[PDB]
Design a protein around this ligand. Structure first.
Ligand code: ZN
Ligand code: ZN
Ligand code: ZN
Lengths: 131, 280, 783, 97, 69, 49, 116, 190, 57
């Protein structure tokens, strides 16, 4: 029961699946043009001279110590490029689990607490002059 | 004292003087003896395992070092054996039935008897050297829905009575006030104490239980205690009062040879009427 | 040092300000009452009153006419659209000769109540808006607060006030009934929308099933009316939900609620509580027993609807739902009228999320992992303001009235009356038979202080809400406003601990000034610097900021347990982070809220980070912009600036009192002045710090019993009984806070020469001696 | 350290659905994706169908205002990665029964 | 209220100086000490009478029913 | 011993209710009484008497 | 599916019934109607431990790392002041207050209190 | 109420040594070395552990209570009367107390030597579940002053923290202040 | 009463010729018995007394 304004995604682009290869999920700020980047670390990174922080949020999307505890399931184009199948790799149809989940998010550098301006000696109660 | 003439006060304490020849250790030793013991006290840890042809329960109990509580609470593993061997088990399968009903070499021979007398016991075992543990297995019908074993068992051991005393709870050794050498207890039994005479002189035993004194020893001695206690109140408050008042008060409540409060009851016997009228 | 500033106060006395007072602190000192009363009609909402009646919606009955096939009769739609209150105005007699402004001055001298009229937009509709009609119905003159927006005197400069014949600096902010000054004192209650953990014996006392463990949360709708939800852990491991309604409690299997919310699966139900925590059997053991019990007791309901179908059936008459209404609808009502209503009707999935969260934490309590919340600790408390309560009571009376409309009609129908919904005369025919005047009842409330309703409003007593304003001296007068207590219900309680002073109330309540005697410890006063949150700040942009901080959406992310930092806002769960990640964030927020250069960031906002601990308080992060939040200024450390602090979030902060106390890596905040922790009367007494505290207490009451300067309105003042010092002086030794309120206006006493000596032997036993001549010379003249 | 970006796909390719832990669907099951162009934000809706189950999914209106999601294919015998844009849909499984 | 007549203890008449005293701080703008010194009040017993006085009678004058404002 | 009336209006005091009133008529009006020839006032110290 | 003694249908999220409760040889979801082999799983076990506080005892104290016990001399209560014992004439008595001032002899332990 | 110069000079000296008193009391209770610095995590841990027990807490106090009492018994013993500016009989404050006219050495002593450690129903100040006595104190501090030990005297003035404490102690007797028996006796005994 | 919490009760309006007088010849207004202080222990009252003379001079 298609809602107002949505059209079926007709021609789905290609997704080359398969020390072997890994599948990652990455969050970027919506305002970031992803189509023009180069680097990526394995801490901190800058994109378009503005600086961000990369966090390994894998233990939130899944378990590090135990298998099959993944929140997300990957859906890849099927043999028609007009629909999606659950992505698998196991030759068992066991759904693919993300190898890693990364969050590229905003950071705010913090400065020091100017103790010179702020930690000031006590002053005595002022003597009244000219008594 | 005065208002209620309470039968059971919250905190009756027998006052036990001892012979001089006894050392402190022996009494301290002896204090533990007459003292009350409980299973929940000696348990290091409990580990129970359930499995599912039927619904089965393997139950591992861990105690402390035998000598320790054997020293601490003066315990023979045999009782510890026998206690579970008798009363613990009888209690144990008992409530579980109610629980269910609510839902709608010699060891091997020792293991044999209990299993016979008690339905769900498929196994018994215990640590017969170090006493470090007791462990045994239980089973139930397969279809039986889950029960929480730990809490059911948790409740039990706290209700255990490894070695209780006749109306006797805890004995405690205070400091030798005023050159007096005494043990302090809770609960009151004279008879039971009458066997400890080797350690304690009998004639110096006092208590707040005065009714029982009146019960056991009659009225006069009881009266004497009455004064003592009442004084001790003001005494702690460092407040002096003529004993004459006390004795007057004392001899008053005893005129029937019984123990009389001042209330409707104590007043009831009054030949004088109007005094009973304006009262309640 | 200090100054007498005589020439200043003289022209001041000579030349009443024609713009504004010189004593703002004085004004703000009363501000909450004004604030509490203001927003009733105010705010972009169009006033609270509109929201509530909006939340009341309609009542409908069916005439049961055959109509000439099951037909239960025509649909009468009765709805109150809007509320309106005119400033106090009086026509001359009848004939509606143009009304004139009625200054509170006359209202006293008439021995009356200073009152504006109340009016309503009443929509009369029929058969699903097949027909609709309007009218405005006079509700009568409603009592109105001084210095309100509804008060004509509002905004008027002192000089004009003189012209209107009132006190120069007059704060007002109260009610006048039968020419008597009354006002509503504040009460303390638990927090809005917060999941506290409780241990009370009364729990098991409810029934043998129950432990002494339980979770409680007090939810408050946007209208500021509240609803409270309670959970008792059954000794067998079940947990039954508890609400009350019409002062009547009912119990529910929690699962049934769970599935009723959204269409959901057991794993979802499971994965919520346990999440990654699967290794504990104690949990699994419990959780399993839960579901199996729900099974086989209700194996017939596999469907969210089937459940709801079942539900509306049970409670329909309890909500007296109209015959037309399917139990499905009736059930839809129930979730709406009851559970977590603070989240609105459509937050079901988030309600679902939160409702889980408690259960998870409920066990940690039962598991004893987490220490219990002291109920009466200052940490979890807030003030119920009068103005808010005021309309709540009104809200009731609006409702009951509207119900009474039905009764007549039903009695009309049941009498077999010839009836048409569409005759406005017949409509009006009904009106003439019904009392519309609430303002009388409102007065009657204000008269008697009696709380009378079908709804206890989660409140502990039937009366004592009012108080009689006292001008006896001035200080007694001002005292009332900063004065608040725990309710009389706690007075009967023999438990003394309620009266303990606590290190939490530091900076907020006055440790010094408190009543003695029977009230002692129950009635208490704020520090003078204290503030009260009268508004709902906007949190809209907060979530956006959170995600920018690396917060995971609580939507699709599955976590649970104290193991990692939970995050919420005003009873809304945002997501999940590690503790180590959380506190760093809470800093940045705190860093920004001070910084204040980032939008969406009102500085009133509480940041509630609790570090994880070993069996300490349950960790987490808590954000509050809600109403009624004790808030007080603290000087920062870095960008040296003022900051606002809630008592709750205070607990863990390291506060330095004086700059000399400061140690590196210790304190993040310093108090402006140590005085700030004290209160006005606490600030008055000279050098109290040299005097043993029980005195300081005792003193504070004495001032309130002194014969003071009541006010300048005496000539026009109709008040029952008063006492007037003939002549006051300015106490020489004094604290600057005196001038800051400038009590020079109201001298309470005089300076005199006193010698400390043993002479007549009469001075023994503290009796005091009077030089006889000075009396003849007029010293200490009164009247 | 350093990772080179081979390609970045801007067009609908793959999708991501959060159902619950351990979620799977029968072999045959196939999912139809749908897309609307609201402002300069892209909304997605998911609808899947098999013999006795339905599957539905939507993009969270609130998070998509500030979160953009991207699936990556990583070549560790290289310093390279291949990024594809993907919506994350909040999804449920409904029993036709 | 209004300036009292006499020093309560000294009995010395303090009244008249008030107006003149106000003038002193007004025109002369002096201290209080030399002012009262100029008024010649030696015993503080009298000084306490002036220094702490209040003209509070004033604010009363602002309400007169005897005249239409 | 009496059946209530119309669920309210309070029981009218009977002779039985008249006897035990407060501390009871014995205690209230007999065991203590208002008296004549007496006064109540504040006191003040003097060594001189 | 199998989690901590419990098993769920891989289709729906429903808890699967106990096979031991199941009469037949297979388990089918009462909802999504997915049949599962009974023998696919059997004979799970669960091991638990009691809480550490469930059974307080004296041994608990001796197991604790801190001092829970009291001897006689630590019982000295309050600072000492020079006080003539009206009983034994001692010069030192301990005291406490309420201004109601206690006194306790150092020598004979005699007590008295002073309100004045 | 003035000391001589040396009296204060004395009054300093004993009060000076009081510094590490608290920390030492802890190490013994915790069964740790006396010289364990207050920053030891285990030390800090045990405290939190201790903080969890009702009993151990009360147990801790009395230990701390004991030591500081001895402190108190030094300042007063040295300064009154030997360090007073005016001596009996000219010193009326002393003469009134001495002659038992009014008050006891306790009043004068505490108002001149110091108020010592506060006590609440045989305890110290209850701690906020934060592990902090007071927002001016980091959690789990060893100072007796951090636990309500008052080194001030009404003469020289008291710090606000100190002051805020005493307010509690004041609130005791009031709450505390907040025949039927004897009537029964007399009646029967007429 | 004072601001120090000392409550007192009038006793004898005391004819002034009897009032002991200062070196400066000043008849004290109100007399207090020092025996109140060592009980109530309110020192600032003494202190306030000082400044009272200090400022006024
Ligand atoms: Zn004079
Ligand atoms: Zn399934
Ligand atoms: Zn003695």
């Amino acid at each position: 029961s298609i809602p107002d304004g949505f059209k079926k995604c007709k021609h789905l682009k290609n997704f080359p699946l398969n020390k072997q290869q890994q599948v990652w999920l990455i969050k970027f700020p919506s305002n970031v043009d992803i189509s023009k980047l180069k680097s990526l670390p394995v801490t901190t990174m800058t994109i378009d001279k503005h600086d961000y922080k990369i966090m390994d949020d894998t233990d939130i999307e899944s378990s590090l110590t135990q298998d099959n505890l993944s929140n997300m399931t990957l859906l890849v184009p099927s043999e028609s490029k007009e629909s999606l199948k659950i992505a698998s790799t196991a030759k068992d149809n066991a759904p693919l689990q993300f190898d890693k989940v990364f969050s590229v998010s905003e950071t705010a550098k913090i400065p020091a607490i100017d103790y010179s301006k702020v930690r000031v000696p006590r002053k005595d109660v002022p003597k009244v002059e000219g008594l | 004292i005065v208002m209620t003439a309470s039968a059971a006060i919250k905190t009756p304490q027998m006052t036990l003087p001892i012979w001089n020849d006894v050392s402190d250790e022996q009494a301290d030793t002896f204090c533990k003896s007459i003292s009350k013991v409980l299973l929940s006290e000696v348990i290091d840890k409990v580990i129970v395992t359930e499995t599912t042809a039927a619904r089965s329960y393997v139950i591992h109990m861990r105690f402390f070092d035998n000598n320790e509580y054997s020293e601490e609470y003066d315990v023979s593993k045999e009782e510890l054996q026998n206690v579970i061997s008798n009363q613990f088990i009888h209690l144990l399968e008992a409530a579980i039935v109610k629980e269910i009903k609510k839902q709608k070499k010699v060891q091997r021979d020792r293991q044999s008897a209990i299993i016979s007398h008690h339905r769900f016991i498929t196994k018994y075992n215990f640590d017969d050297e170090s006493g470090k543990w007791c462990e045994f297995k239980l089973e139930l019908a397969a279809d039986t829905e889950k029960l929480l074993m730990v809490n059911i068992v948790e409740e039990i051991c706290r209700k255990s009575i490894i070695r209780q005393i006749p109306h006797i709870d805890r004995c405690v050794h205070p400091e030798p006030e005023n050159g007096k050498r005494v043990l302090v207890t809770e609960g009151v039994n004279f008879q039971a104490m009458w066997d400890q005479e080797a350690f304690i002189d009998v004639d110096g035993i006092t208590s707040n239980d005065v009714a029982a004194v009146l019960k056991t020893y009659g009225v006069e001695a009881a009266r004497n205690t009455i004064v003592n206690e009442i004084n001790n109140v003001f005494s702690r408050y460092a407040i002096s009062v003529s004993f004459r008042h006390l004795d007057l008060i004392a001899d008053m409540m005893t005129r029937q040879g019984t123990y009389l409060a001042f209330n409707r009851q104590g007043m009831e016997t009054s030949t004088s009427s109007f005094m009973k009228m304006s009262y309640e | 040092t200090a100054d007498f500033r005589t020439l200043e106060r003289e022209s001041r006395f000579i030349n009443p300000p024609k713009d504004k007072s010189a004593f703002p602190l004085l004004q703000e000192a009363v501000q909450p009452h004004i604030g509490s009363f203001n927003a009733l009609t105010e705010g972009p909402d169009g006033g609270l009153l509109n929201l509530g009646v909006k939340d009341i919606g309609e009542k409908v009955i069916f005439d049961g006419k055959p109509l000439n096939s099951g037909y239960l009769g025509n649909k009468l739609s009765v709805s109150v659209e809007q509320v309106s209150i005119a400033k106090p105005m009086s026509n001359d007699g009848v004939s509606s000769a143009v009304e004139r402004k009625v200054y509170p001055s006359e209202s006293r001298q008439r021995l009356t109540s200073y009152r504006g009229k109340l009016l309503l937009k009443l929509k009369w509709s029929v058969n699903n808006g097949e027909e609709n009609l309007f009218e405005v119905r006079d509700c009568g003159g409603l009592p109105v607060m001084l210095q309100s927006n509804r008060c004509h005197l509002n905004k008027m400069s002192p000089y004009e006030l003189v012209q209107h014949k009132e006190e120069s600096d007059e704060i007002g902010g109260y009610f006048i009934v039968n020419g008597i000054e009354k006002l509503i004192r504040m009460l303390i209650v638990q927090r809005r929308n917060h999941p506290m953990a409780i241990i009370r014996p009364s729990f098991a006392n409810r029934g043998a099933s129950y432990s002494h463990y339980g979770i409680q949360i007090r939810s408050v709708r946007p209208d500021q009316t509240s609803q409270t939800n309670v959970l008792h852990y059954l000794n067998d491991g079940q947990v039954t939900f508890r609400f009350s309604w019409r002062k009547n409690e009912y119990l529910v299997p929690v699962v049934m609620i769970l599935k009723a919310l959204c269409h959901t699966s057991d794993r979802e139900i499971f994965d919520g509580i346990i999440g990654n925590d699967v290794k504990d059997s104690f949990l699994t053991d419990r959780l399993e027993l839960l579901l199996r019990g729900f099974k086989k007791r209700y194996p017939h309901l596999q469907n969210r609807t089937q459940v709801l179908q079942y539900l509306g059936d049970k409670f329909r008459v309890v909500f007296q739902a109209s015959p037309d209404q399917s139990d499905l609808e009736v059930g839809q009502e129930v979730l709406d009228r009851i559970v977590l209503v603070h989240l609105g009707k459509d937050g079901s999935q988030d309600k679902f999320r939160m409702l889980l969260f408690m259960i998870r934490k409920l066990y940690s309590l039962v598991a004893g992992e987490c220490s219990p919340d002291n109920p009466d600790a200052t940490q979890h408390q807030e003030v119920l303001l009068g103005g808010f309560l005021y309309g709540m009571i009104l809200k009731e009376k609006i409702d009951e009235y509207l119900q009474n409309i039905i009764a007549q009609v039903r009695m009309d129908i049941n009498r077999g009356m010839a009836i048409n919904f569409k005759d406005k005369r017949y409509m009006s025919r009904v009106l003439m038979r019904v009392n519309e005047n609430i303002g009388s009842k409102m007065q009657y409330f204000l008269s008697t202080g009696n709380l009378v309703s079908q709804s206890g409003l989660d409140l502990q007593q039937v009366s004592g809400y009012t108080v009689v304003a006292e001008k006896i001296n001035f200080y007694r007068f001002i005292s009332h406003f900063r004065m608040v207590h725990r309710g009389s219900f706690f007075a009967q309680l023999k438990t003394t601990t309620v009266r303990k002073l606590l290190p939490e109330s530091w900076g907020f309540l006055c440790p010094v000034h408190t009543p003695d005697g029977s009230p002692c410890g129950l009635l208490n006063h704020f520090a003078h610097k204290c503030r009260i949150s009268t508004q709902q700040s906007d949190v809209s942009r907060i979530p956006s900021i959170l995600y920018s901080l690396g917060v995971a959406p609580a939507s699709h992310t599955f976590a649970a347990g104290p193991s990692l930092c939970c995050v919420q806002i005003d009873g809304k769960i945002i997501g999940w982070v590690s503790h180590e990640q959380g506190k760093i964030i809470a800093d940045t927020l705190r860093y920004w809220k001070v910084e204040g250069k980032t939008p969406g960031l009102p500085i009133d906002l509480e940041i509630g980070y609790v570090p994880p601990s070993t069996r300490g308080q349950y960790p987490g992060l808590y954000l509050f912009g809600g109403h009624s939040r004790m808030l007080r200024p603290v000087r920062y450390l870095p960008l040296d600036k003022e900051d606002i602090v809630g008592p709750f979030e205070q607990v863990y902060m390291n506060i330095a009192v004086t700059p000399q106390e400061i140690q590196n890596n210790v304190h993040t905040h310093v108090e402006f002045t140590p005085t700030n922790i004290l209160s006005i009367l606490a600030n008055l007494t000279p050098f109290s710090d040299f005097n043993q505290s029980p005195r300081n207490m005792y003193q504070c009451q004495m001032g309130k019993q002194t014969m003071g300067t009541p006010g300048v309105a005496l000539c026009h003042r109709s008040d029952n009984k008063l006492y007037r010092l003939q002549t006051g002086q300015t106490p020489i030794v004094k604290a600057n806070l005196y001038d800051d309120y400038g009590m020079d206006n109201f001298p309470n006493g005089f300076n005199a020469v006193v010698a400390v000596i043993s002479y007549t032997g009469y001075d023994m036993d503290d009796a005091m001696i009077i030089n006889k001549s000075a009396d003849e010379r007029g010293f200490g003249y009164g009247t | 350290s350093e990772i080179e970006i081979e390609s970045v796909q801007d067009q609908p390719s793959v999708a991501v659905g959060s159902f619950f832990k351990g979620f799977r669907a029968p072999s045959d099951t196939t999912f139809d994706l749908y897309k609307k162009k609201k402002s300069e934000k892209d909304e997605f809706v998911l609808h899947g169908e098999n013999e006795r189950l339905e599957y539905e999914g939507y993009t969270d209106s609130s998070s998509q205002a500030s979160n953009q999601y991207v699936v990556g294919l990583f070549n560790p015998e290289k310093k390279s990665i291949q990024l594809y844009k993907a919506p994350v849909l909040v999804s449920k499984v409904v029993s036709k029964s | 209220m209004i300036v009292p007549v006499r020093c309560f203890s000294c009995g010395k008449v303090v009244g008249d100086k008030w107006e003149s005293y106000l003038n002193l701080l007004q025109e002369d703008e002096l201290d209080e000490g030399t002012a009262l010194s100029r008024l010649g009040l030696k015993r503080y017993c009298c000084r306490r009478m002036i220094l702490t006085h209040v003209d509070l009678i004033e604010k009363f004058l602002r309400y007169n029913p005897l005249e239409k404002r | 011993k009496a059946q209530g009336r119309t669920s309210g209006k309070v029981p009218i005091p009977g002779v039985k209710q008249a006897l035990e009133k407060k501390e009871g008529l014995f205690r209230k009006h007999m065991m203590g009484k208002r008296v004549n020839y007496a006064a109540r006032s504040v006191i003040s110290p003097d060594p001189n008497i | 599916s199998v989690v901590g003694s419990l098993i769920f249908c891989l289709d729906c999220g429903d808890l699967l019934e106990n096979p031991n409760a199941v009469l037949g040889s297979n388990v089918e979801c009462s909802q999504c109607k997915a049949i599962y082999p009974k023998s696919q799983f059997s004979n799970l076990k669960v091991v638990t431990t009691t809480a550490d506080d469930a059974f307080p005892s004296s041994l608990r104290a001796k197991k604790s790392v801190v001092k829970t016990s009291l001897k006689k001399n630590e019982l000295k209560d309050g600072a000492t002041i020079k006080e003539k014992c009206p009983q034994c004439g001692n010069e030192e008595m301990n005291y406490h207050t309420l201004a109601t001032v206690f006194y306790t002899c150092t020598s004979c332990g005699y007590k008295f209190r002073t309100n004045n | 109420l003035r000391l001589t110069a040396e009296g204060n000079k004395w009054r300093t000296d004993i009060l000076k040594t009081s510094v590490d008193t608290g920390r030492e009391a802890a190490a013994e209770v915790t069964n740790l070395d006396k010289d364990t610095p207050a920053d030891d995590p285990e030390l800090l841990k045990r405290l939190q552990e201790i903080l969890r027990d009702n009993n151990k807490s009360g147990i801790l106090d009395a230990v701390t209570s004991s030591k500081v009492n001895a402190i108190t018994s030094q300042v007063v013993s040295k300064c009154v009367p030997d360090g007073t500016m005016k001596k009996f009989p000219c010193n009326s404050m002393q003469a009134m107390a001495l002659s038992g006219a009014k008050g006891s050495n306790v009043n004068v002593s505490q108002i001149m030597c110091l108020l010592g450690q506060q006590a609440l129903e045989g305890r110290r100040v209850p701690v906020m579940v934060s592990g902090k006595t007071l927002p001016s104190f980091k959690p789990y501090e060893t100072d007796a002053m951090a636990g309500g030990y008052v080194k001030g005297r009404f003469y020289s003035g008291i710090k606000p923290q100190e002051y805020y404490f005493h307010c509690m102690a004041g609130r005791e007797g009031l709450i505390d202040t907040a025949g039927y028996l004897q009537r029964c006796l007399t009646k029967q005994l007429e | 009463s004072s601001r120090h919490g000392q409550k007192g009760v009038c006793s004898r309006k005391w004819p002034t010729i009897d009032m002991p007088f200062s070196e400066t010849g000043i008849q004290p207004d109100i007399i207090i018995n020092p025996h109140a202080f060592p009980s109530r222990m309110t020192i600032g009252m003494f202190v306030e007394s000082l400044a009272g003379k200090a400022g006024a001079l």
